[PDB]
Design a protein around this ligand. Structure first.
Ligand SMILES: CCCCCCCCCCCCCCCCCC(=O)OC[C@H](COP(=O)(O)OCCN)OC(=O)CCCCCCCCCCCCCCCCC
Lengths: 80, 89
């Protein structure tokens, strides 16, 4: 019922493609991969990173608070 | 071979296609190839050299595809390229 031939109505659209044996599999891989990755990470880093930053701060604070919770209070054994 | 013989002789009928064949033969081959030479080149063709030449020109070759109309179910290039050979030879 839902196969190729009856998916959508498309008019006046031209597509050009070439054979995979005709073109390279890695056309300028590093020289255009690096700026594209940098663009994607600079468009998403402010939405993604600060929650995990404050997870790191909460994790370190909780671990150190537990460590000083196990620490001996020097105020005890001071009266006698 | 019989269909090709009929096609060549029935095409060379009337003054206009004969003049057309003369003009194309002098422009392309540089000479007019007679029908006896065509018949000799037809009768030297057998099944073994036909499948050899067809494997030379059709098997595992990258095709050019041109579609116009409702061509969404026309397969893309990987499926046609994979259909250009058989896994069983
Ligand atoms: C006011 C924004 C100013 C931005 C200045 C930066 C320069 C902007 C212009 C140059 C372009 C730089 C690249 C742009 C990349 C995409 C755009 C972008 O980053 O936009 C800012 C982004 C979205 O802004 P918007 O959603 O409108 O802000 C609502 C804030 N709630 O908003 C952000 O990224 C802000 C995200 C802040 C998130 C704070 C979360 C704090 C709480 C975390 C709790 C986690 C759990 C804690 C523990 C719970 C249990 C104990």
């Amino acid at each position: 019922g839902r196969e190729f031939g009856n998916l959508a109505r498309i008019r006046h659209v031209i597509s050009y493609s070439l054979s995979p044996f005709e073109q390279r599999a890695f056309p300028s891989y590093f020289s255009k991969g690096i700026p594209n990755v940098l663009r994607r990470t600079r468009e998403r880093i402010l939405r993604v990173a600060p929650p995990f930053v404050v997870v790191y701060l909460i994790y370190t604070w909780g671990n150190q608070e537990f460590e000083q919770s196990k620490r001996k209070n020097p105020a005890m054994y001071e009266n006698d | 071979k019989n269909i090709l013989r009929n096609a060549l002789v029935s095409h060379l009928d009337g003054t206009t296609p004969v003049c057309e064949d003369i003009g194309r033969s002098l422009l392309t081959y540089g000479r007019r190839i007679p029908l006896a030479e065509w018949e000799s080149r037809i009768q030297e063709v057998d099944a073994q050299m036909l499948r050899d030449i067809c494997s030379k020109y059709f098997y595992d070759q990258c095709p050019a595809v041109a579609g116009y109309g409702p061509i969404e179910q026309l397969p893309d290039y990987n499926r046609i390229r994979s259909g250009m050979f058989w896994l069983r030879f």
